[PDB]
Amino acid sequence: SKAAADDFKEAFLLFDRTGDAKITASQVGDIARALGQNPTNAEINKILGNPSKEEMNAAAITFEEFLPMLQAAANNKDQGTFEDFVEGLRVFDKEGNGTVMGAELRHVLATLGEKMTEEEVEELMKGQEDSNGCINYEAFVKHIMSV
Template sequence: MAQDHSLLGLRLLFSFPLLHLHLLKMAEEAPAAPAAASDFSADQIEDFKEAFGLFDRVGDSQVGYGQVADIMRALGQNPTNKDVAKILGNPSADDLANKRLAFDAFLPMLQQVDVIPKGTLDDYVEGLRVFDKEGNGTVMGAELRIVLGTLGEKMTEPEIDALMSGQEDENGSVHYEAFVKHILSV
């Protein structure tokens, strides 16, 4: 069970930097009076519909049940497979492979995922602790750069440089708890 928690933390960590920047951008563009947490703007819904259409491999304006989690993640959410299965009504393997879903049925599911609490400081720290070989609260900056550029939501070199700016000590190590606090405060 602890390993599942670590994996969730890693998944959240690798998706977090770009998601966090995306959410900040959305917050800047949001109207002064915030909408309810489960309400999406017309522009967001159009973006979601366009992304949904990219996953339609048949041309019937529907996607397979097995693609729902991928679409949600492509739209900046980070649901667990268990969350998605619950939202889909715990489908069988056959349903995942064969059932299809229209956008009108998908949008309320996306709204459900949007209100699921996101990762906490502890989740992200736990995810980085996996890379702490010496158990001293640090990870090698070079290793962290590789991870950020190759796993999860792959970041570009300029994005990694901006994120890592001022985070490495004289030995090239990053104190990961302080690093996560820095990211969450941006």
């Protein structure tokens, strides 16, 4: 709305590697996340196809399409409730203390639903899981929602 945030246009100049002021359709998922929006990858996929837009063939972009797609994704930020994120992992391990065994969270984050690479899974556990093999998800989900 501007509140006209012109820093979204300045961040589009940091993600366009050619400097022509266009951003390919394959970068739009990760740049919506870098502007403070977490649409799921199936949602980013649907919307695209919904608009008869094929992410399979070469794509370019213009700021005039990327701005309204970020504004259509911005209504879905009401789905980011931290009660359900901590209660999900509280149902994932027994006893009254928030600890996932290391390999349980790593294999679930790579193979269940939207596949996260094991390189990204190791980069998200690095520092929050110590050598006991127990990830405290009270501080883990706190630090994941700090970015």
